[PDB]
């Protein structure tokens, strides 16, 4: 079963980066360099190429991760004229894909910028990704606009398609397996973006802990739909629902049952394990237990009906009726970190150290994706597979033991990691891009060097 992988995030006319391609390794891609180099920003460009939605795009500083105080981060990292941020994909169908974002500053009065998602299909593996947005006049490069790209391809075996609504962009990447989740509604974009954001600043992404069940659980659009209908027929059923639930929950509980097993030999500092303990609200537990053994029938809206039933078990606190259908509502998810002390302990930042928290965090993220993908097998083909990739800016927080463990993992499940070592030492396995910000005529100018194959 073939699985797609990104090959190059080439940034154009960005801060300190003119035409610098970035080749991603099958597994790890480490950005080596000194302070204020271009590591983070390089990823910035990446992040952008996926979620070109400015609403969510906010590049704070790794010195502020819980900053619910929404100046920005995206403007500066680009220079005057036309810029880009593109991605090279190796679709499970060995199809090269050029999903990119075009950028260009705006009237200097307010740090505002513009975005136009675009893609390029059937791009002869002979031409370099960078030789798509360049010319040669008087021996000095010339970045070309999208209307320029159009013409250079208008009549060719190569197809080009500018987009208007992010959805068009997004949905496209998903159709070709670049995106794991269905990026339909905008609220969806939040979940995704925050994961990407979460991978960055590293740690136990708080925001993905409160709505912890909003990410790991498929709310079946089949349930509500098919279920309701049964009623449309009934009018012109009893506990057949009760059966549906504890089997639908048993199902997903078996889903979660395994993903955990996928995380046992993980060792970060003291953390020797991360699980997704699935608990069922007593409130609903006795209800599921109620609509089973006992039987006090009141056949007078199944929705409405069920509601009254909550009055039975609940001597506390319509809408109760319906809500009480969805799989989720009958649960209470959580996360725990295995140690040598008190066996397993609910995940808690205040109780963990920098490293221990990042790993756990990474985990939770690993799980996020290892849920969205499969939860999408239906809406996908039997021959397409999404790409799995995460981040870990300032990966120096991880020693040797921790960092290494991160590797064996991506290898464990098939993934890629664009880590960044503010320090020069780092893993020998994988690709390494050493950066050096130079000054030529008082102009930024990053200096890249490649290394891969060592192993």
């Amino acid at each position: 079963i073939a699985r797609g992988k990104f090959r190059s995030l080439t940034l154009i006319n960005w801060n300190g980066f003119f035409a610098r391609t970035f080749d991603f390794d099958e597994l790890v891609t480490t950005l080596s360099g000194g302070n204020g180099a271009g590591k983070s920003t390089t990823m910035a460009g990446f992040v952008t190429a996926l979620i070109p939605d400015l609403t969510l795009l906010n590049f704070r500083n790794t010195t502020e991760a819980g900053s619910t105080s929404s100046d920005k981060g995206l403007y500066g990292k680009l220079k005057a004229g036309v810029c880009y941020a593109v991605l090279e994909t190796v679709n499970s169908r060995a199809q090269r894909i050029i999903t990119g974002v075009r950028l260009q500053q705006i009237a200097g009065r307010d740090k505002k910028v513009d975005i136009r998602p675009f893609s390029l299909q059937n791009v002869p593996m002979t031409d370099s990704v960078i030789s798509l947005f360049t010319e040669q006049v008087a021996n000095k490069a010339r970045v070309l606009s999208l209307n320029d790209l159009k013409e250079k391809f208008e009549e060719t075996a190569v197809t080009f398609k500018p987009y208007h609504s992010i959805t068009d962009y997004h949905s496209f990447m998903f159709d070709l397996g670049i995106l794991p989740k269905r990026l339909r509604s905008s609220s969806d974009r939040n979940k995704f973006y925050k994961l990407i954001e979460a991978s960055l600043y590293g740690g136990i992404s708080s925001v993905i802990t409160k709505s912890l069940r909003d990410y790991l659980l498929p709310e079946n659009s089949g349930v509500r739909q098919a279920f309701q209908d049964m009623e449309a027929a009934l009018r012109e059923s009893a506990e057949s629902v009760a059966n549906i639930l504890r089997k639908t929950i048993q199902r997903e509980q078996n889903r979660i049952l395994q993903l955990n097993q996928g995380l046992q030999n993980i060792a970060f500092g003291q953390v020797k394990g991360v699980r997704l303990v699935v608990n069922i609200r007593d409130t609903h537990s006795i209800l599921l237990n109620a609509l089973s053994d006992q039987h006090e029938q009141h056949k007078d809206s199944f929705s409405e009906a069920l509601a009254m039933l909550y009055k039975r078990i609940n001597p506390h606190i319509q809408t109760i009726g319906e809500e009480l259908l969805d799989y989720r509502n009958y649960l209470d998810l959580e996360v725990e970190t295995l140690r040598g002390a008190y066996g397993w302990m609910r995940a808690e930042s205040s109780a963990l150290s920098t490293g221990e928290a990042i790993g756990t965090g990474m985990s939770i993220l690993l799980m996020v994706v290892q849920s969205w993908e499969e939860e999408s097998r239906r809406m996908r083909a039997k021959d397409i597979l999404p790409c799995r990739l995460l981040f870990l800016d300032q990966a120096a927080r991880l020693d040797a033991m921790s960092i290494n463990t991160l590797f064996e993992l991506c290898e464990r499940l098939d993934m890629q990691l664009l880590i960044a070592a503010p320090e020069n030492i780092s893993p020998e396995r994988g690709t390494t891009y050493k950066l050096v910000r130079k000054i030529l005529a008082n102009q930024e100018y990053v200096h890249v060097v490649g290394l891969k194959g060592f192993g």
Binding site: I12, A19, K140, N424, V436, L440, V449, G450, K452, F454
Partner: protein
């Protein structure tokens, strides 16, 4: 509750490798003959065993840059993955031309 106190010394002759590599590359400064790491590397590896292969790389690179910057690096052209070894490892970087001071 016991308590002593013991200090350990860390000896990294990595400093010599650097100095020898400094002059080895510095050698290129004097002469206008650029520093093609596709050759500087493919040759230098032949000296030290593949045990400390990686480390040697970084330093030749780290040093190869503190000395200058590619010229056709502003001509926007994808640098090809110039391979080395008989196995896998490779390097990506245009020749290093004009100097800095």
């Amino acid at each position: 509750l016991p308590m002593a106190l013991e200090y350990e010394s860390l000896t990294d002759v990595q400093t010599q490798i650097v100095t020898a590599i400094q002059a080895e590359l510095a050698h290129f400064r004097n002469t206008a003959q650029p520093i093609n790491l596709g050759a500087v590397l493919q040759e230098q590896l032949a000296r030290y065993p593949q045990s400390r292969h990686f480390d040697v790389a970084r330093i030749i690179v780290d040093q190869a840059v503190k000395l200058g910057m590619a010229s056709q690096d502003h001509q926007a052209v994808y640098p090809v993955w110039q391979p080395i070894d008989d196995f896998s490892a490779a390097v990506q970087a245009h020749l290093i031309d004009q100097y800095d001071k």
